[model samples]
Target: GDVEKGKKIFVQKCAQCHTVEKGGKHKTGPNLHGLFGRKTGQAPGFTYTDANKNKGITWKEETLMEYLENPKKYIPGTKMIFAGIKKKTEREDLIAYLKKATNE
Candidate 1:
């Protein structure tokens, strides 16, 4: 299994609120379409918390992995409430899926 394994994990845990494809809109959380290379808090039609807006971060691979590891640590007081991926491989797989889904 490759990144598609992460897609399965995403669908199981994250798809409820996050859309992993282009042109998707925000639900409970912001759409993650094209998240790579995108600036933090820049998802259209989604209002970001002041903490995230002030972080001045870009969603590169490293940043995304860090955020996925612990979102509260990366952007303190941000709205994302994910518990974070505990397994290292799962995180890597999810990042792969995200890159695949968003093509970035």
Candidate 2:
């Protein structure tokens, strides 16, 4: 569900924090504008925890999956605070939805 497909995953869980719109304003989290490929915690003006800001990561499929698997261990002390997605299929769909939404 582009936005809708990712809606439950993003909106229900992340909307209060992030704004995934193409040019959406900066909410508590970054808008994830453009390719969403910038390094971790490096989205424009948004401030990120030290562990995340300069982590040298990009939100690519492989990157997203690795972090989603264990955010805390991947980058200890990260402010992402997500419990992490555990299901592979759900992860696949979620990543697909995110990629589709960000692609536009």
Candidate 3:
């Protein structure tokens, strides 16, 4: 629906491990700032699993959507542990929000 709603999803669904702000610091997971157009597992300080670092993936709408759908399936050995975004609406909104945030 709204970017605001997507932001809320971040708090409830991803905030426990991820940060979505520009240049945001890492928590249990890596900072997701400006992630679009970037490589996977390239956060400044986080120690990414070898599987992810070597994936050679670029984070774009399609790839991110696939990954968010199931991080492990997209990148086996990825450290992110989440079931997935089962709701289509929430998944779409979150991707849109992330697109805007990363572009900024």
Candidate 4:
């Protein structure tokens, strides 16, 4: 996945509510710094719905690949309201960008 392409997708699809930089402020969505390897709904100050808190899933590359495709399907009753990424390549690009941007 191309990181630059992923960034474009993020700007279009996720920027309205998400902030991926370290120490970034939380918006409608949680700040996604250090997202990979963390459990679902565990970002420090954000309030997660029961659906996300109870999912008991970790955020890894493979898991995120699925979740980003259909967040509602993966965790029914989630607070997130965006329609999923229907394209596999776009999903890959987004995940790749997230992995890079949300880390040191």
Across 19-66, the per-residue lDDT of candidate 3 in tens digits comes to: 777778788899888788899888898998999899998998789778
TM-score of 3: 0.90
Q: Which runs in model 4 stand beyond 4 Å of their true positions?
A: none
| Global lDDT of model 2 | 0.72
Clashing pairs in 4: none
- Candidate 1 backbone clash number: 0
Best candidate according to TM-score: 4
For residues 3-54, write the lDDT of model 4, one tens digit per residue: 8999999999999999998889999999999999999989999999999999
RMSD each, Å: 1.6, 2.3, 1.4, 0.7
- Please report the TM-score between candidate 4 and the true structure: 0.97
Best by lDDT: 4
What TM-score would you give candidate 2 relative to the actual structure? Answer: 0.82
Clashing pairs in 1: none
Ranking by TM-score: 4, 1, 3, 2
Angstrom error of the Cα, residue 98, model 2: value is 1.2
TM-score between candidate 1 and the true structure: 0.91
Model 2 poorest 10 in a row by lDDT: 1-10
TM-scores of all predicted structures: 0.91, 0.82, 0.90, 0.97
